Nucleic acid binder design. Structure first.
Ligand SMILES: Nc1ncnc2c1ncn2[C@@H]1O[C@H](COP(=O)(O)OP(=O)(O)OP(=O)(O)O)[C@@H](O)[C@H]1O
Ligand SMILES: [Zn+2]
Length: 689
RNA sequence: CAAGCCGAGGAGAG
RNA sequence: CUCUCCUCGGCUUG
């Protein structure tokens, strides 16, 4: 309802037209000033007898409900009609109609793009930008190459150039809306010079039709008093040890390579070796040669184990391998449980190579003489704070992978010292259904946030989900364990730690360039402000000229892209799908069908009598509903499916291999859209009637 | 709650 | 340009 002094000046030009960007630091009441500007805009459009509608755009799902509950509704409930949309309600259905009411909309973005392209592609109702008078945005800095709402802004700019060309031609120029982007920092877009950074800023300002940036400069002391930074801090460690376990694994890896007669020309325990392994597997599968592809699939697991060894305990890698080989033995026993039994030489050699050393590795792993350095350093770092703050002790840990989060949470649950000091901990990751891990769900996320704000969990171990959006309580001891993405995540994490005696820690090893990257991002942070100062003081006419040039280039860079996007044959049955582990036939292209033009499936008894089902583990931690399919060899293929009560089994194209009938350039595809040919829709005329 | 499709961005390494 | 990791969004079957 009321404004601050430093918010007043930064908001001021927006109050009379003047589409702009606003970059303030974190936590300066960005949402609140957005709210004031909404209220002023609507009251103004009322006093002039003009229709007024505001739409807010966000990138995530939770920010919509967040802002609907905390900021917009509690202040605007009395004067105006408010609503909040996402893909997690039922209000998505009549989007063209809610616009006819509800002067204040909050929304996830791609709703709007879907409605626009429905208006411009089909005969649906749809909507256009003309039905609005203001678009407020969160997190401007995502406006880049073919992102979510660069699309929208490309259409806005297309219509603006239409209006500008028409100004000289006709009088009736459509009234375009006003645009108010909000952010924390637009961020330099990967540029090695101050000038290229300036260029990137101007590209953003073009893609938002802005007029200025309006950083706070004048009423600055009030900001420093109300708002403060943490202290940057580095904690490095090193190792000159860990021979017994590492070498105990390298021996195995060398044995396998010398069993395969392959030359890596690389090092064990890095990423180039992994890349080599992947391409070797793909080549061996395109050829069909076993004894080299499966050993590659195993060496990948060993390399991953070594990689996590550099950051995590030996026991976690041992558990990884244990789960893997246990699953494999279970697969082989499920296969041989039916009908005579033949064994392979390769898998036999590998299992005999592993299980003989399994107890050895379990003994070597448990050895606190040389556990790891970084873990101990963060032990010191954590215990310092949690002894200092005494029950006002909130916390965040950031890391790279998901599995690291589970391991760290388990570890903190085990070791008594953390529980003694009141270190209640919990993990957190994102919902993408990929990456060989069971993701979490939005509900568990929200619950964890609410427990954090309550204080049931003192510290949150997280992946990069946290270094934006969702509103975590002010913290003290944000750290960074093996992750440096860019300046944006850096500054956003650096904006979390309020509650004085806050920090910003970075934990790395010696022989992995990371502090390098930290310092690079620090300099980029110091550079973008200089560029901002260079452009704020730029001449207006030169600014206008430059943004016009950039808008033109951005619209022409779309058109060129469009031609290649639109430009694809149709072969009904010119392929055969084989198993990828075992060079064995599975299916032809004709047997396959599609449901809802998305899910691929087969419904011939021949394919029904060529696989075995097992029990789901994701649903084991109940009754299984979506079984996991396997081959007679052991390779997982797909997943069950329940369409119209029929238990017709789906499948993937990541686990199979293609053979064309002509000349056998066998290929791997990793997903269905990449290949050119089309499959037919499903119909019950086959198998029935 | 499980399963799958499509699109986008960031980082590394090559 | 490729591989991997991380995140997000929209949409289907159950
Ligand atoms: N003008 C204001 N006067 C008083 N308190 C304010 C004002 N603006 C914001 N706040 C307070 O700040 C809290 C949230 O605002 P804050 O800016 O810290 O988070 P935010 O808006 O999400 O910032 P960011 O999006 O950058 O994290 C609210 O609880 C509110 O009480
Ligand atoms: Zn097989």
């Amino acid at each position: 309802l009321q404004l601050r002094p430093y918010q007043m000046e930064v908001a001021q030009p927006a109050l009379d037209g003047k589409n702009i960007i606003i970059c303030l630091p974190t936590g300066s009441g960005k949402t609140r000033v957005a709210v004031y500007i909404t209220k002023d805009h609507l009251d103004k459009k009322k006093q002039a007898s003009e229709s007024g509608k505001v739409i807010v755009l966000v990138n995530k799902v939770m920010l919509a409900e967040q802002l609907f509950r905390k900021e917009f509704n509690p202040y605007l409930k009395k004067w105006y009609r408010i609503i909040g949309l996402s893909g997690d309600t039922q209000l998505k259905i009549s989007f063209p109609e809610v616009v006819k009411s509800y002067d204040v909309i909050i929304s996830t973005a791609q709703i709007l793009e879907n409605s626009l392209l429905n208006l411009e592609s089909g005969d649906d109702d749809g909507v256009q930008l003309s039905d609005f008078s203001l678009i407020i945005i969160d997190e401007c800095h995502h406006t880049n190459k073919e992102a979510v709402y660069n699309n929208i802004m490309r259409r806005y700019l297309k219509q603006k150039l239409r209006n500008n060309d028409l100004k000289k031609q006709n009088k009736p120029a459509i009234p375009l809306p006003q645009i108010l982007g909000l952010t924390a920092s637009p961020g330099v877009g990967a540029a090695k010079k101050q000038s290229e950074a300036e260029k990137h800023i101007l590209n953003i300002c073009a893609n938002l039709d802005a007029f200025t940036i309006k950083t706070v400069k004048e009423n600055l002391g009030q900001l420093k008093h109300q708002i403060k930074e943490p202290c940057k801090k580095f904690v490095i460690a090193d190792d000159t040890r860990e021979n017994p376990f590492k070498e105990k694994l390298l021996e195995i890896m060398a044995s396998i390579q010398t069993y395969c007669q392959k030359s890596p020309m690389s090092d064990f325990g890095t990423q180039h070796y992994e890349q080599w392994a992947i391409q070797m597997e793909k080549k061996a599968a395109k050829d069909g040669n076993r004894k080299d592809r499966v050993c590659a699939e195993h060496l990948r697991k060993y390399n991953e184990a070594l990689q996590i060894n550099d950051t995590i305990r030996m026991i976690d890698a041992y558990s990884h391998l244990e789960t893997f080989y246990t699953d494999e033995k279970e697969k082989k026993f499920a296969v041989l449980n039916d009908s005579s039994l033949k064994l392979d030489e390769t898998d036999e050699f590998l299992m005999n190579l592993f299980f003989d050393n399994k107890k050895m590795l379990k003994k070597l792993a448990e050895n606190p003489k040389y556990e790891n350095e970084k873990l101990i350093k963060l032990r010191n770092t954590i215990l310092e704070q949690f002894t200092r703050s005494e029950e006002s002790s909130r916390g965040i840990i950031f890391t790279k992978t998901r599995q690291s989060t589970y391991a760290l949470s388990q570890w903190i649950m085990e070791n008594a010292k953390f529980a003694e000091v009141g270190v209640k901990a919990h993990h957190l990751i994102g919902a993408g259904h990929s990456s060989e891990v069971k993701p979490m769900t939005q509900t568990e996320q929200k619950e964890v946030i609410s427990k954090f704000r309550t204080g049931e969990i003192n510290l949150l171990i997280a992946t990069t989900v946290a270094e934006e959006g969702l509103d975590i309580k002010e913290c003290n001891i944000v750290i960074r364990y093996g992750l440096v993405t860019n300046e944006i995540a850096m500054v956003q994490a650096r904006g979390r730690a309020r509650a004085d005696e806050s920090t910003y820690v970075l934990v790395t090893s010696s022989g992995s360039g990371v502090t390098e990257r930290e310092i690079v991002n620090d300099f980029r942070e110091k550079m973008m402000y200089k560029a901002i100062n260079r452009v704020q003081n730029m001449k207006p006419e030169e600014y206008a000229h430059k943004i016009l040039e950039l808008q033109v280039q951005s619209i022409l860079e779309k058109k060129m892209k469009v031609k290649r996007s639109i430009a694809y044959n149709d072969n009904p049955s010119l392929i055969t799908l084989l198993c990828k582990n075992c060079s064995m036939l599975v299916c032809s292209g004709e047997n396959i069908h599609v449901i809802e033009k998305m899910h691929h499936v087969n419904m011939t008894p021949e394919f029904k009598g060529l696989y075995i089902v097992r029990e789901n583990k994701a649903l084991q931690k109940d009754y299984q509903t979506n079984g996991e399919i396997i081959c007679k060899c052991g390779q997982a293929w797909g997943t069950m499916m329940v369409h119209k009560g029929l238990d017709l089994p789906c499948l993937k194209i990541r686990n199979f291999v293609v053979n064309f009938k002509n000349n056998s350039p066998k290929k791997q595809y990793k997903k269905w859209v990449e290949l050119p040919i089309r499959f037919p829709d499903l119909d019950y005329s086959e198998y029935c009637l």
